[PDB]
RNA sequence: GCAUGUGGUUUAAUUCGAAGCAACGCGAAGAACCUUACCAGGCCUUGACAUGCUAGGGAACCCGGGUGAAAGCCUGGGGUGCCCCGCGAGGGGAGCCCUAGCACAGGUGCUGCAUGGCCGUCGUCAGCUCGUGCCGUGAGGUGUUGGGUUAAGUCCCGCAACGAGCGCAACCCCCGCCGUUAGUUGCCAGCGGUUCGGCCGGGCACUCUAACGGGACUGCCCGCGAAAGCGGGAGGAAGGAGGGGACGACGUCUGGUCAGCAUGGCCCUUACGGCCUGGGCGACACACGUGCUACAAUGCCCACUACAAAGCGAUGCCACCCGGCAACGGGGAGCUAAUCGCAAAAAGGUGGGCCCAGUUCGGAUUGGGGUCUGCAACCCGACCCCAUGAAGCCGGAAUCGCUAGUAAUCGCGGAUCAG
């Protein structure tokens, strides 16, 4: 995991959009590309559409899904089975 | 007073110093038998003496560096024989029969490319 | 925390992950590797024994 | 036991040091 | 060795870590030797020409 | 996938390097590329003068570029002007004190790189390829040489079928190490495509 | 008092140059520890021969930086005034440290 | 069982080539972004790069805001240099910049069956040929064949042949013995001083380091043979090519590669060019190839104790102290290095444990907690510690390697490289 000295990593510009959405009490959909961002408890209850290489898919953020990074909730490849 | 002989064997170099007396032998600041603690081969190193009958009539101050201990053994073993002749040029006659003056030319073979090992070719298996 | 009381926590830990709907979740669900291994070969301890299927005729003719 | 990362052999082969094969 | 990527190669990039070497000659990305800034093709070629100084052919 | 570059084989035994200097790991990378930028330019700018070798000796902030050329006047220039222009443009691209001297390849018939070239030109100028070769090899042996060999390969003539022509006289002992053997290679660039000329010249047993 | 290291690629020129320095220090009034052959640091390179595939053929090149030490104890002035007048091989680097 | 490559299938994309030996740990000696050629999305259009040209606006250049995932898009200020004419206002000009338009650049788009170069290959196999003479109407033969010998078209005898060229051999490198020159950062034999470390004096003997040399020729003896040469012995460190390297003949494969580079021809030019962010190359009902680790007692674990070589490193290797189970972190000496370091060599040796068990064998898989690199470890890094402790009890039909310091076995280094 990420070293504990440097805290966690979220892209400033996603963290940006939420603080404005919090410090105004608004719950409007967000889209981003930075899968790579951790999930601070500040994001909780929001909805973030994240890129999976093709589209943005909504990801409602509940409590228990905080330690993780956003990408874990939009798989990148499509699988059915073999026929 | 001393008699020297320089024995090498396969990346090992032995420095043999002979001085008559009891029979005791030092390698690298330890007793011969403590240095080669549990090595069977070790005894062979003192075959050059035994085959001229001068074991006991000498001591040895020896040093080795390089190789594994066995390599050091056949190097000492050379070095002693090399030394028995600077002392007594007539000893050659006794040693050359079993060829104790012969530097073992044998040595580790260059790893060659496209092999795994110099010879050990990679496996061809199936079709 | 020991015995079956520990089996509890590990079990309900994976359970969490599936219920979350995260990647490691799906991998657990579908019985695939989880820490990121290859699957085009090996990956056997996760999928148990080998369910051989049909296949084709390569490369020239037969 | 070269695959066993809890032996001297284990760390010897992985080229690492740990509890089970420390430096000095 | 598409032209742009030889130039991009030189562009000091947004992060220290997109630093990558190509061959000062062909521009080849892949088998590039630090020490010469040449690939293992170019190395071979210039070595035979005699234009890499003190670079002999080995043999032991 | 056959024969070894006759030079790199003999290199250090019967044949010398075209760059002679020392450099530690730190500096080498760039003094190399600096040489290659020099040899890049002088090669373009002097094809007219028929140039065999570009020697690059080096000190510290010093470069002794010896240029080996058939027609040494063409390099010099009328008045002495052309050489000054080079030396400045050199010391521009180098940013060091370039010391460019000129050396008269007294006999282009025993310079493989030149024999090579002369043929390639001939091939470009649309000359008969077979004759072109026998007649080149000819000229080489006529001038002392102990052996010689020229290989043109590619779309010979117009030719849909790319083949290979070659010819030799005397001994050209590519296996014999002590054999001084000059090699040179020329590339002919043509409306129908590109062909390569190798020329080997056996010069003397050492 | 004056210690000269000699590092170059070609060992003929390297060795030659060092003779031109063992004698320079003689004809000027001093004794000398001879040209000592320090070990030589080889840099090997192992390129695949062909351009594409065919990994099972390589070619081995090396880069041999040769090292000679030379010491001039009892260093006079008629010594130094015969050293900054030499320089005769090109591919040899000199470094002088009065230690 | 796992690591990699591949077939297939799947996919928005799983970039592309390699395809019997001679494709499959192969191009890749380093795919998280980059690489990167594929896919999705947002962007630029004389373009990220070359040399220019016509017309206008500008010194070049420097810093800040807006929007944005970034790219890009819009916008604010600072700045007036140089060359010529002039007293000056100022006109002209070089360079660089922007806008419009034109030559054009760019293309890892196609064709390796249009090519160069380089390589794989039969094959380090002993062959492939030419001048003259000779045989034959001629294609062609002779020589090169035959008998002996050889690793060898290597030599001997023979012969219508006598030679020669490319090949074999030799000249080059490493290893094995000795010499001369050389004494530091290496070395310690007798000696002086010792904090017991070659540490200090001192010395180069020895080891070594590394530059030049000597040495081996079937030379000697016996036996066989017209000869070449073969068997055996002596002296010798080495004996009949002493061991290993580099070195690939005329040609074959329409072999490989337009994706290293180069290049003919065909194709695209606000798109097949270029920038970016994200995804992919890592997908998984399956199949093969190459390998790692094992299935254990000639073993496993823990402790103590020995003996290497080759490399690498002053943007780095990091000794020693400290915290920490540890990865590692903080402090910090030496070293541009025969000095300082990486560095513990592991098998081995001595002691003790386990006692035939899916085990103190095996270490997959997963849960949890950390470390480091990196803008960033979800897809997809390695490492540490706790817990989990799968298959596997020596492998069917088939099949591979190796003839001596070889195989088997055990560790060590390096290239690429932030990792
Ligand atoms: N390189 C090379 O020579 O081959 C070597 C080996 O791989 C053979 C290969 N063998 C196998 O698969 C077998 N091995 C085990 C797996 C399965 C199978 O049982 C193969 O494919 N054989 C048949 C198959 C077949 C049956 N029917 C069609 N149409 N094909 C074939 O294709 N023959 C060709 C022909 O009939 O012409 C071929 O071109 C050939 C020409 N001369 C010979 Cl001899 N062979
Ligand atoms: Mg922002
Ligand atoms: Mg070995
Ligand atoms: Mg060796
Ligand atoms: Mg291989
Ligand atoms: Mg191995
Ligand atoms: Mg175990
Ligand atoms: Mg191109
Ligand atoms: Mg990189
Ligand atoms: Mg050929
Ligand atoms: Mg060709
Ligand atoms: Mg080969
Ligand atoms: Mg593929
Ligand atoms: Mg292609
Ligand atoms: Mg890799
Ligand atoms: Mg990518
Ligand atoms: Mg990208
Ligand atoms: Mg004026
Ligand atoms: Mg003015
Ligand atoms: Mg093009
Ligand atoms: Mg082809
Ligand atoms: Mg093909
Ligand atoms: Mg006739
Ligand atoms: Mg024949
Ligand atoms: Mg042969
Ligand atoms: Mg012959
Ligand atoms: Mg004493
Ligand atoms: Mg001293
Ligand atoms: Mg020698
Ligand atoms: Mg005879
Ligand atoms: Mg040969
Ligand atoms: Mg083809
Ligand atoms: Mg891949
Ligand atoms: Mg299987
Ligand atoms: Mg501690
Ligand atoms: Mg530390
Ligand atoms: Mg041990
Ligand atoms: Mg025991
Ligand atoms: Mg079982
Ligand atoms: Mg059992
Ligand atoms: Mg054999
Ligand atoms: Mg290793
Ligand atoms: Mg490294
Ligand atoms: Zn290149």
Residue holding tokens 């070095």?
Answer: B79
- Number of CB atoms found within 10 A of residue G85's CB: 8
Asked if the G1-99 domain carries CATH number 3.40.50.720, the reply is no
What residue segments make up the domains of chain E, in order of their start?
1-60
Specify whether the CB–CB gap between A40 and A15 falls below 8 A.
yes
CATH of the domain spanning C9-62, picked from 3.10.180.10, 4.10.910.10, 3.40.50.720, 1.10.3720.10: 4.10.910.10
**Assigned token pair, F104:** 């008269």
Give B87 Cα–ligand 27 centroid separation in angstroms: 25
**DSSP conformation letters of F37-91:** HHHHHHHHHTGGG-EEEEEEEE-SSEEEEEEEESSHHHHH-GGGHHHHHHHHHHH
- Domain range enclosing B45: 1-127
Specify whether the CB–CB gap between F9 and F177 falls below 8 A.
yes
- Nucleic strand H near CB of residue B1 (< 7 Å): no
φ, ψ of residue F64 to 5 degrees: the values are -110, 85
Residue in C55, C56, C57, C62 to alter for ligand 1 test, most ligand atoms within 8 A of Cβ:
C62
**b/e burial code for range G49-64 (CB count within 10 A of at least 16 → b):** eeeeeeeeebbebbbb
**For residue F5, which of E28, G9, G61, G45 has the smallest C-alpha distance?**
G61
Chain B positions touching G56 (Cβ under 8 A) are 113-114
Residue of least CA–C1' distance to H336: F24
Q: Distance between CA B112 and CA B122 in Å, rounded?
A: 12
Q: Distance between CA A37 and CA A14 in Å, rounded?
A: 8
State whether E53 and F5 contact (CB < 8 Å).
Answer: no
Q: If you ran DSSP here, which 8-state letter would residue A69 be given?
A: B
Burial of E43 (0-12, 13-18, 19+ CB in 10 A): buried
What residue segments make up the domains of chain G, in order of their start?
1-99
- Number of CB atoms found within 10 A of residue C25's CB: 19
- Residue ranges of the binding site of E: 23, 26, 39, 42
Distance from residue B78 (CA) to nucleotide H229 (C1'), in Å?
Answer: 37
**Which H helix or E strand runs over F142?**
helix F129-142
Specify whether the CB–CB gap between B76 and B16 falls below 8 A.
yes
| Structural domains in chain F plus CATH codes | 16-106 (3.30.300.20), 107-206 (3.30.1140.32)
**What experimental approach yielded this model?**
X-ray
Helices (H), G1-99: 11-22, 77-80
**Which H helix or E strand runs over F115?**
helix F112-124
Interface test with F, best of G90, G92, G94 (most F CBs within 10 A): G90
Query: ∠ CA F140-F143-F147 to the nearest 5 degrees?
Result: 50
What residue segments make up the domains of chain A, in order of their start?
1-83
Chain breaks in chain F (C to N over 2.5 A) after: none
Q: Distance between CA F112 and CA F201 in Å, rounded?
A: 6
Distance from residue F88 (CA) to nucleotide H91 (C1'), in Å?
Answer: 35
Resolution in A: 3.5
CATH superfamily of E1-60: Ribosomal Protein S14/S29 (4.10.830.10)
Four-residue CA torsion sign, F172, F175, F181, F185: positive
Give G57 Cα–ligand 12 centroid separation in angstroms: 5
Query: ∠ CA B63-B64-B68 to the nearest 5 degrees?
Result: 155
Residue D7, C-beta contacts closer than 8 angstroms, at least 6 positions apart? D1, D20, D21
- Number of CB atoms found within 10 A of residue G3's CB: 16
Nearest-ligand number for the alpha carbon of F162? 11
The two beta strands, F101-104 and F62-69, are parallel
Specify whether the CB–CB gap between G29 and G76 falls below 8 A.
yes
Q: What residues sit around ligand 12, an ion, with C-beta below 5 angstroms? A: G 57
- Nucleic strand H near CB of residue A3 (< 7 Å): yes
Chains that touch A (3 or more CB pairs under 8 A): C
**Assigned token pair, G1:** 């008092």
Half-sphere exposure of C20 (CA within 13 A, CB side): 27
Nearest neighbour of A73 by CB, restricted to C16, C22, C53: C22
Four-residue CA torsion sign, D7, D10, D13, D17: negative
Q: Distance between CA A25 and CA C39 in Å, rounded?
A: 46
**Which H helix or E strand runs over F205?**
strand F193-205
Cα of B123 vs its chain's centroid, Å: 38
CATH of the domain spanning A1-83, picked from 3.10.450.50, 3.20.20.70, 1.10.3720.10, 3.30.860.10: 3.30.860.10
Helices (H), B1-127: 32-35, 47-50, 69-87, 92-95
Query: C62: Cβ below 6 Å to ligand 1?
Result: yes
- Nucleic strand H near CB of residue C40 (< 7 Å): yes
Query: ∠ CA G81-F98-G85 to the nearest 5 degrees?
Result: 10
State whether B114 and G46 contact (CB < 8 Å).
Answer: no
**DSSP conformation letters of B57-69:** SEEEEEEEESS-H
Of all protein residues, whose CA lies closest to atom 13 belonging to ligand 1?
C62
**DSSP conformation letters of F7-36:** HHHHBTTTB--SEE----HHHHHHHHHHHH
- Number of CB atoms found within 10 A of residue B10's CB: 18
φ, ψ of residue F9 to 5 degrees: the values are -80, -40
Burial of B27 (0-12, 13-18, 19+ CB in 10 A): buried
**For residue B84, which of B105, B43, B41, B53 has the smallest C-alpha distance?**
B53
Q: Looking at chain G from residue 2 to 41, which residues have their Cβ under 8 Å from any Cβ of chain B?
A: none
φ, ψ of residue G63 to 5 degrees: the values are -145, 95
Four-residue CA torsion sign, B40, B41, B46, B52: positive
Q: Distance between CA A3 and CA F189 in Å, rounded?
A: 60
3-state secondary structure of A81: coil
Interface test with E, best of F29, F57, F186 (most E CBs within 10 A): F29
**For residue F150, which of F165, F170, F171 has the smallest C-alpha distance?**
F165
Specify whether the CB–CB gap between F22 and G7 falls below 8 A.
yes
* Chain B 50-69 residues whose Cβ is under 7 Å from strand H: 61, 63-69
Q: If you ran DSSP here, which 8-state letter would residue B45 be given?
A: G
CA distance A8 to chain C (A): 19
Query: B127: Cβ below 6 Å to ligand 1?
Result: yes
Give F171 Cα–ligand 30 centroid separation in angstroms: 34
Residue B98, C-beta contacts closer than 8 angstroms, at least 6 positions apart? B51
Q: If you ran DSSP here, which 8-state letter would residue F112 be given?
A: H
Q: Is the peptide bond before C59 cis (omega within 30 degrees of 0)?
A: yes
- Residue ranges of the binding site of E for Zn(2+): 23, 26, 39, 42
- Nucleic strand H near CB of residue B77 (< 7 Å): no
Q: Distance between CA C38 and CA C57 in Å, rounded?
A: 25
Of all protein residues, whose CA lies closest to atom 12 belonging to ligand 1?
C62
Chain G positions touching E48 (Cβ under 8 A) are none
Residue of A nearest to C24 (CA): A72
């Amino acid at each position: 995991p990420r070293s504990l000295k440097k805290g966690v990593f979220v892209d400033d510009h996603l963290l940006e959009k939420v603080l404005e959405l919090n410090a105004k009490g608004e719950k409007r959909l967000i889209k981003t590309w930075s899968r790579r961002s951790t999930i601070v408890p500040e994001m909780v209850g929001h909805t973030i559409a994240v890129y999976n290489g093709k589209q943005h898919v909504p990801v409602y953020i509940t409590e228990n899904m905080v330690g993780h990074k956003l990408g874990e909730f939009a798989p990148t490849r499509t699988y059915r089975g073999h026929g | 007073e001393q008699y020297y002989g320089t024995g090498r064997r396969k990346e090992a170099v032995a420095r043999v110093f002979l001085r008559p007396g009891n029979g005791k032998v030092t390698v690298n600041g330890q007793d011969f038998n403590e240095y080669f603690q549990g090595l069977v081969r070790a005894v062979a190193a003192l075959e050059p003496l035994r085959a001229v009958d001068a074991l006991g009539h000498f001591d040895a101050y020896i040093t080795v560096r390089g190789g594994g201990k066995s390599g050091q053994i056949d190097a000492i073993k050379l070095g002693i024989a090399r030394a028995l002749v600077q002392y007594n040029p007539d000893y050659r006659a006794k040693l050359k029969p079993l060829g104790f003056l012969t530097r073992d030319a044998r040595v580790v073979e260059r790893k060659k490319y496209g092999k795994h090992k110099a010879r050990r070719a990679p496996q061809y298996s199936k079709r | 925390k020991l015995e079956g009381e520990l089996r509890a926590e590990v079990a309900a830990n994976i359970k969490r992950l599936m219920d979350i709907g995260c990647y490691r979740g799906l991998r657990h669900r579908r019985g695939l590797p989880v820490r990121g291994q290859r699957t085009r070969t090996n990956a056997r301890t996760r999928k148990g024994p080998r369910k051989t299927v049909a296949g084709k005729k390569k490369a020239p003719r037969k | 036991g070269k695959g066993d990362r809890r032996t001297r052999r284990g760390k010897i082969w992985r080229g690492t040091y740990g509890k089970y094969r420390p430096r000095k | 060795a598409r032209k742009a990527l030889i130039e991009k190669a030189k562009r000091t990039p947004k992060f220290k870590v997109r630093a990558y070497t190509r061959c000062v000659r062909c521009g080849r990305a892949r088998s590039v030797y630090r020490f010469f800034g040449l690939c293992r093709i170019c190395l071979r070629e210039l070595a035979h020409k005699g234009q890499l100084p003190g670079v002999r052919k080995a043999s032991w | 996938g056959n024969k070894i570059h006759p030079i790199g084989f003999r290199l250090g035994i019967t044949r010398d390097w075209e760059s002679r200097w020392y450099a530690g790991k730190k500096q080498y990378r760039h003094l190399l590329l600096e040489d290659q930028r020099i040899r890049g330019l002088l090669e373009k700018e002097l094809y007219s003068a028929g140039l065999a070798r570009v020697d690059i000796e080096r000190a510290a902030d010093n470069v002794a570029v010896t240029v080996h050329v058939a027609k040494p006047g063409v390099v010099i220039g009328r008045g002495g002007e052309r050489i000054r222009v080079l030396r400045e443009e050199l010391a521009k691209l180098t940013g060091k004190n370039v010391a460019l001297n000129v050396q008269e390849v007294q006999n282009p018939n025993l310079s493989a790189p030149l024999v090579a070239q002369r043929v390639a030109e001939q091939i470009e100028r649309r000359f008969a390829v077979r004759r072109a070769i026998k007649q080149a090899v000819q000229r080489v042996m006529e001038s002392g040489a102990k052996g010689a060999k020229v290989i043109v390969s590619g779309r010979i003539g117009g030719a849909e079928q790319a083949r290979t022509e070659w010819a030799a006289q005397g001994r050209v002992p590519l296996h014999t190490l002590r054999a001084n053997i000059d090699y040179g290679f020329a590339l002919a660039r043509t409306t129908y495509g590109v062909l390569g000329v190798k020329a080997y010249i056996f010069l003397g047993e050492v | 008092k004056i210690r000269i290291k000699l590092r170059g690629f070609d060992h003929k020129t390297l060795d030659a140059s060092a003779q031109k320095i063992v004698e320079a220090a003689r004809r000027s009034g001093a004794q000398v520890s001879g040209p000592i052959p320090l070990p030589t640091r080889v840099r090997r390179f192992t390129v695949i021969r062909g351009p594409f595939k065919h990994k099972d053929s390589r070619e081995h090149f090396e880069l041999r930086t040769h090292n000679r030490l030379v010491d001039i104890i009892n260093p006079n002035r008629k010594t130094i005034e015969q050293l900054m007048t030499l320089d005769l091989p090109t591919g040899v680097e000199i470094e002088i440290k009065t230690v």
